[PDB]
Design a protein around this ligand. Structure first.
Ligand code: NA
Lengths: 9, 104
């Protein structure tokens, strides 16, 4: 499955 | 403004564009949200005729208001793909009867 959430930077 | 009143329901906007909902989003978002606390499945509504950064509304109902607050604070301004997400609260009673197009 696609993973799109990115950690805050 | 209704999106600012803390509740256990979080509304996420600008995750994806109009017509771009898929199941991978819902599965991942529920997993991500479990970081803040126990949460239900994504409930999705698309507003007809809305701008591309508002059309798709993703709602998640947390078990606890504290978790919802944590979720709003962490998810607002985070990236889902290349899109900058907007997070806010949503009125619980409106949510429970599926009135999903309220102004926030
Ligand atoms: Na993820």
């Amino acid at each position: 499955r696609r993973r799109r959430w990115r950690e805050r930077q | 403004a209704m999106g600012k009143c803390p509740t256990k329901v979080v509304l996420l906007r600008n995750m994806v564009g109009a017509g771009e909902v898929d199941e991978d989003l819902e599965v991942e978002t529920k997993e991500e949200c479990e970081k803040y606390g126990k949460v239900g499945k994504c409930v999705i509504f698309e507003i007809p005729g809305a701008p591309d950064d508002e059309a798709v509304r993703i709602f998640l109902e947390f078990e606890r208001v504290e978790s919802a607050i944590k979720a709003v604070v962490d998810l607002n301004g985070r990236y889902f793909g290349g899109r900058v997400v907007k997070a806010c609260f949503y009125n619980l009673d409106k949510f429970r009867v599926l009135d999903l197009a309220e102004q926030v």
